[PDB]
Structure formats: structure tokens, C-alpha cells
Design a protein around this ligand. Structure first.
Ligand SMILES: *[B@]1([O])=C2[C]=[C]C(F)=[C]C2=[C]O1
Length: 267
């Protein structure tokens, strides 16, 4: 019905920028969902870093790791785009701060250190997702090589749907106890890279938590978000985009729009 109209508009939008748009959104109040290409594979980019953060908090809650434990890395050669790890190289950082840095500043240093020392690499990352009943998600490579975003390449991809369900399990559901879920929420709420994406699509007194991704190839970018409107149950929104050519740039505004259309569909 209204579902058919939102698909028209999404279709228009991707043809407008000569690329591919994938959306999944859920209204946690009514059970309403909407998907456009919600089953197709898209490159993850930094977006899995939000799940990494959750996988840590999981280990913390089972008492396998302490959120305050020093993590030192003074001799490491820090990957490109390590703004937070770089400023604390000489003192180190707590496991908590490191995890949140991976999520809030998309910190590559934070990402790889955590996966090599606590999470058991990409395979370990994949295993974490399998354990929340997400079968699409697959992280294969490390930063930065995982961001190649070659069309057709299934490495380091998921689907909008699977990303939506996962965020929902993690941000709103059963996986984390009350105390830890709260921490996880605040981490997403404090994300700094997502102002022009899903956040731009919502009334500015809704509370949003998000994690963005940008590949730097094939104009590949994404965002996923948990949203608390004012008088209303939260929404989950998940938007993934690619473009036809290698040199193409990502489009914040397209994701913004696709979020806008998505949210109207489940309204
Ligand atoms: B994501 O996705 C990424 C990757 C790489 C770089 F350099 C940056 C970033 C952000 O997010």
C-alpha cells in the first residue's frame, strides 16, 4: 500500500545517483517493518565497529574482561584514521575507552587491537554475530583492507535486514543486562560521525544512537540507528549504499533521504 510508494521513491533515489540503496526499518511499537533490497549484500565498512563494541561489552558482562583494564600499545604502528588511539599512545587506554573510540570515532587502531587481543580477529567477530542469530554478517579481513568494497565481493558484507535485526537484539533486546545495555546505548548515542546521515532525517529532539560506515571506494557508505521519538516506542533504521564506479564518492544526503523515506514507510 504505502509500502509500494516508498519503494518507488527509493528506486528513484538510487537511479538519481546511479547506485544501489538497501534499507530496513522497524517500528518496535507496532511491529511494522519496511525493506528495500533488505536481503541484498552490501559492504560493511566501519559499521561493524558498532558490533565490535557490543562484543566487548558482552565479554565484560561475563567477567572475561574488565572495562577498566589498561590496554597498552606504545610500540604499535597505528593504522590510518586512529585519531583517539594516537593521542593516548604513550599512556594507553582502558578497554572501555578503547571500544567506545572504535565506535564513536570509527578508530582503526582501536578496531584492530581489540580484534587481535580480545575478540579473536574477523572470524571471532563473525562468531559473535552468529551467536546473536545473525547468519548474513561476515567479517573476513582487518582494517583497512576490508574497505575495498569491490562490486560482487561478499567479503565483509551483510544485509540491511540482518543489520537491523542485530542492532535491535543488541540495543533494545536480551543480549546485554540492564547496566551494560545502558552503557552500549550511551556509546551509540554519543557517536560523532553521523550528523549528516540518519540523524539528519529525524526531528531534532528525537534521541538517536548510530554507527556510520564509509569505504572510500565505489561511493560506499552506510548508517544504522536506534531512534527514541518523543511519545513513542523506538525505531530501528538501517541504510546501506554503493555506486557503480570505483572513483565515486559516497552521498550523505542520499542516506539522509533514504532514512526519511524509510521512517515514513513504517509510520
Ligand atoms: B569507516 O568505515 C572507515 C574506514 C577507513 C577510514 F580511514 C575511516 C573510516 C571511518 O569509518
Amino acid at each position: 500500500n504505502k509500502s509500494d510508494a516508498a519503494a518507488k521513491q527509493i528506486k528513484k533515489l538510487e537511479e538519481d545517483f546511479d547506485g544501489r540503496i538497501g534499507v530496513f526499518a522497524i517500528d518496535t511499537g507496532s511491529g511494522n517493518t519496511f525493506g528495500y533490497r533488505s536481503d541484498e549484500r552490501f559492504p560493511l565498512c566501519s559499521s561493524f565497529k558498532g558490533f565490535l563494541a557490543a562484543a566487548v561489552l558482552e565479554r565484560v558482562q561475563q567477567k572475561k574482561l574488565d572495562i577498566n583494564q589498561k590496554v597498552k600499545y606504545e610500540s604499535r604502528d597505528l593504522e590510518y584514521h586512529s585519531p583517539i588511539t594516537t593521542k593516548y599512545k604513550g599512556s594507553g587506554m582502558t578497554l572501555g575507552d578503547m571500544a567506545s573510540a572504535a565506535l564513536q570515532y570509527s578508530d582503526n587502531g582501536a578496531t584492530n587491537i581489540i580484534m587481535e587481543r580480545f575478540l579473536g580477529g574477523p572470524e571471532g567477530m563473525t562468531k559473535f554475530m552468529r551467536s546473536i542469530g545473525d547468519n548474513e554478517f561476515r567479517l573476513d579481513r582487518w582494517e583497512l583492507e576490508l574497505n575495498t568494497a569491490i562490486p560482487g565481493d561478499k567479503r565483509d558484507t551483510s544485509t540491511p535486514k540482518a543489520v537491523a535485526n542485530s542492532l535491535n537484539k543488541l540495543a533494545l533486546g536480551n543480549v546485554l543486562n540492564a547496566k551494560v545495555k545502558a552503557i552500549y546505548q550511551n556509546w551509540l548515542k554519543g557517536n560523532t560521525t553521523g550528523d549528516a546521515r540518519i540523524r539528519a532525517s529525524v526531528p531534532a529532539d528525537w534521541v538517536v544512537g548510530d554507527k556510520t560506515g564509509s569505504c572510500g571506494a565505489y561511493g560506499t557508505a552506510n548508517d544504522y540507528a536506534v531512534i527514541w521519538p518523543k511519545n513513542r516506542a523506538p525505531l530501528i533504521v538501517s541504510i546501506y549504499t554503493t555506486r557503480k564506479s570505483k572513483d565515486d564518492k559516497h552521498s550523505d544526503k542520499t542516506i539522509a533521504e533514504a532514512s526519511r523515506i524509510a521512517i515514513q514507510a513504517i509510520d
